[PDB]
Symmetry: C3
Subunit: 397 residues, 3 copies
Amino acid sequence: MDVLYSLSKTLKDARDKIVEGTLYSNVSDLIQQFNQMIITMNGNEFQTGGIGNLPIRNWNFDFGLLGTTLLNLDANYVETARNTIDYFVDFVDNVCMDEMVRESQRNGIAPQSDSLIKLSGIKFKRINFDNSSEYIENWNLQNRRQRTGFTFHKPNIFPYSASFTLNRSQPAHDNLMGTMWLNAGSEIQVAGFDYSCAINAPANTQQFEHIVQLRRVLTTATITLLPDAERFSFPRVITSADGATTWYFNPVILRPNNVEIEFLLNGQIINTYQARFGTIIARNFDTIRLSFQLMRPPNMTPAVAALFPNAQPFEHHATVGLTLRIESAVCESVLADASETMLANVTSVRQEYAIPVGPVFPPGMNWTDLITNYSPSREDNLQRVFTVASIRSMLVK
Amino acid sequence: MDVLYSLSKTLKDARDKIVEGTLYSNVSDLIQQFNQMIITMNGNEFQTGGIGNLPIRNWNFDFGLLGTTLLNLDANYVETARNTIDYFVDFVDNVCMDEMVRESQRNGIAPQSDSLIKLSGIKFKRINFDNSSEYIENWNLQNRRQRTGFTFHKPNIFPYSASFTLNRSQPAHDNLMGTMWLNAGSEIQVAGFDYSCAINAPANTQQFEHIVQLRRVLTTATITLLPDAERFSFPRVITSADGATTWYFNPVILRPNNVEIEFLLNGQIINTYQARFGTIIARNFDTIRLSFQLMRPPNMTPAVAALFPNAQPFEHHATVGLTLRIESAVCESVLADASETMLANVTSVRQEYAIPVGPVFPPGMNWTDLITNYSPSREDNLQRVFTVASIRSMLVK
Amino acid sequence: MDVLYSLSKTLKDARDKIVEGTLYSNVSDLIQQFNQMIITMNGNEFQTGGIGNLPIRNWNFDFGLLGTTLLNLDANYVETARNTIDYFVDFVDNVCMDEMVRESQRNGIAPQSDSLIKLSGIKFKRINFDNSSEYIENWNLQNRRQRTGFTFHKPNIFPYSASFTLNRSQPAHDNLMGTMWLNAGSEIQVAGFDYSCAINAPANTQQFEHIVQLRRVLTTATITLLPDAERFSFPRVITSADGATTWYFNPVILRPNNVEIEFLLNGQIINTYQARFGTIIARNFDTIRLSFQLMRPPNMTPAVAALFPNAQPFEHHATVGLTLRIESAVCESVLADASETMLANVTSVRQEYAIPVGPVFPPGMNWTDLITNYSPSREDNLQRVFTVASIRSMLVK
Ligand SMILES: [Ca+2]
Ligand SMILES: [Ca+2]
Ligand SMILES: [Ca+2]
Ligand SMILES: [Ca+2]
Ligand SMILES: [Ca+2]
Ligand SMILES: [Ca+2]
Ligand SMILES: [Ca+2]
Ligand SMILES: [Ca+2]
Ligand SMILES: [Ca+2]
Ligand SMILES: [Ca+2]
Ligand SMILES: [Ca+2]
Ligand SMILES: [Ca+2]
Ligand SMILES: [Ca+2]
Ligand SMILES: [Cl-]
Ligand SMILES: [Zn+2]
């Protein structure tokens, strides 16, 4: 991985710095590194591809070194350098794709393609150079058994889940009480409804609760918490739990009462916020618990009184809700988020080359399936595959 | 462009590295580059501005070289260096603004200001240095006729469009069937409504479809697809198609049935997803097609039955919807997105200096107008102008 | 600050570049810088911690220099280098945390911990090196009394505010007119309602207005403006202004008429947009003013006519709204946003070590409280603290 990264890094720097007119002193060290790369590769043969429709490609290295005697580089110097650069870029791109389309239940963190396995040999170690990207830094820190951390914008931590739970129901579904929600990506919306508006409830208050267990701990999370669940604030016709019929939801929204959000880690409360809407920080957690209540308004104007009778039929359904969004966070495991193209790169290369479903990843690299059962093997393979996607993106986008 | 970029890059590195106390070995190469820049500029005169209220400014270069003999830089060394740096920064900033406020139907990708045209001369090529930003890398790759790729967070690909299409309507607008939507930025929300709840429809199912044609292909897109269109889930009074009257929309939402999203490229299905909500990958597409149905519930509790009579008046309007958001994607053409300040920089400089409307860009650099008719000339000019904005932002924010 | 940053930068580069196999020429300059750091620190003793539960830690420097004679670095070279690196990383991390948990009403921009105060001494200035991060660049520019600019994605500029204003009301709350809104983070949603649907209003039009005053000027803002306020498009039971009772809101949405958004700076209109939805640029402003109207539909189909009678009771409440979101912007003052982890880092370190509430920051570093009363002292302390968090994140995430 580090050598593959170094190949890419060497090529990116070469492409960027070996430009017409530049002082040789601006590239002297890079030329040394570039030539070290040529010397190390020269004489070797590699073959990539062959899985799915990823073409079999042969690579042969017999390049001359780059000159070291111009004061300022001229166009001919730059152009001959690019001939070599373009070939190596094509090679790196193919090694990356070959590596990205493979997986292993047994040793997922290890190189899977022939070329990466070959590049992991001790004779290729002299190419190693400036491992500075966040992904390679993390790869290296992991390897030395140290603490790794990936920063995400809208971390895709919640597998898609949209459902409800009726805590009080009856065949006619005319006097229900329960919750409905949508957990997806970095967002949670949950509504608690009570068709009776807590008419016979103790203290005329109905308690609700929504618990979400993350598959990985998130640290240093910046979160937006807002009252109301807009998604569950409109009239709906929903399928019954058994799928046998449909019920009617006609919500009228009240402010959630006694809101308490707890960010827990291994059952322990790490952060707790009582009725605080806006931006809050959750520093270390693997579980979110949202508790909120519907309290029947003790004083009601006529228009309100008319919505909540003492007896059925209950035609306006009292609803309270919350919306929680994780804007950014750090995770020790790789994850998909709203900004990085890694998942999309890996998924795209596999799709383009008709790569057959393997033993590790769910069909289509489906994110929900992946995060729902995020096993150690899937994570090691995902990290390997995400790191390669990031090496490839330094040169090919 | 590359020389202008190099000027900015040289100045940014100088400002960052030529700091008090630093080992001379930390800046030796930079000093060489800095001095190459001074030597190349010395003796030249440039003039910027004069368009709109952008002031006419004269620049004269007659600077001494930076010394090369301190072991660790002292405060006096740093301060005399900054006198030169600040002047060059002011110059670069003015060249950038002068370039950003100009456009050309004929040769939009080429330098438009006198200073950039002057800097494109062969005598200024020795300043060229470390072209490493994503924008200049792309500029250079484009120039060598190679594949460029810009990565965006929430790519602003959809011109604002908010409308409806009544597939079945009548003067009273009491039994409509059709769709309404909002395409804007990176998001699409579309709802299909049938006032009759498919009472007389074959298989009691009404089919809907929404097609969106992108003005540019997006690759490696990470997308969130969710059922329901919250934006079209509430009661509305809308203007009729002919503007002569207003109709009433009183939606009740049902789950979209047989959801199928197709990401097509030149008429070919590249990706297709059947009822998959959550995160999905669209690898290469220029068109999105959302197909969904409203199926009359075969089994209805009384409360539901009451909403859907066998005869008019139809007072509750059955509605199904979808929401699609492009979180990130790569595009071969520059675009505005939710994170980059390029469009805002260009638009801001033009607005501040009262730059008159030109022959290429729509008044006010209006994004919707621009993307709606994204001609080759507008793109070449936009890219030139975005690349300059990015050169300027290395020094002036 | 600059020396602390330089320590971190030196360590990050060392960790990244001093890798097995690398050409010595790839690290020669860094080794010089690394050794300059060792020489400068050697002989010194520092102590960190002791506030709250941040442990008291002692640091002693007596390290040998790194060798300068290998052609390509070997594993033993890399491993002995890491022993020194890991210790310095641990030291930098502790200095950062000690600094991040402190504050001062008097001189908030100045170092507060013993270690940072010690590192600000002239004898430690030789460590200074390549101050290139956006935060340190800004710190340095501020210091030279120059223009600083931080770029944010979804700048968290609006303190949480969710409320309403009844311009016409009566005890029964059966014929209200006013506005309700939610200002939070980078978003504003505001709705204007008129239970009478402007039946007795001049020109059958009711005017609305929403003004939001930013605590800091935002420049180069890319904004999404859309008609309708989904958050206020559903039925609600709300508490009365005096808290004595509850009123009923049963909205029916109409298109906002004569929409005018003004971005003002010190009372002056800098940007104005008339009914333009989609993406707009606001280049320099400290205030946003949204003006919109509800115009009674001059022509109504029966279904619409039935919602708006000539006399009470008014059962369907005409509502018009707007949604405005600041996607990105530049601010001269540090702020929390949807991507940076600074606020979360500072807040997290203080929470983890049970740091007592101080004299500057609100309890829990509460963002709303902070931005609501963003005094000069809070900003100077926030900037110091955010810059340290950013120095720490180069090594520890
Ligand atoms: Ca062969
Ligand atoms: Ca990231
Ligand atoms: Ca309703
Ligand atoms: Ca756990
Ligand atoms: Ca792991
Ligand atoms: Ca002149
Ligand atoms: Ca971007
Ligand atoms: Ca096409
Ligand atoms: Ca193009
Ligand atoms: Ca002591
Ligand atoms: Ca930022
Ligand atoms: Ca002001
Ligand atoms: Ca300030
Ligand atoms: Cl976002
Ligand atoms: Zn975002």
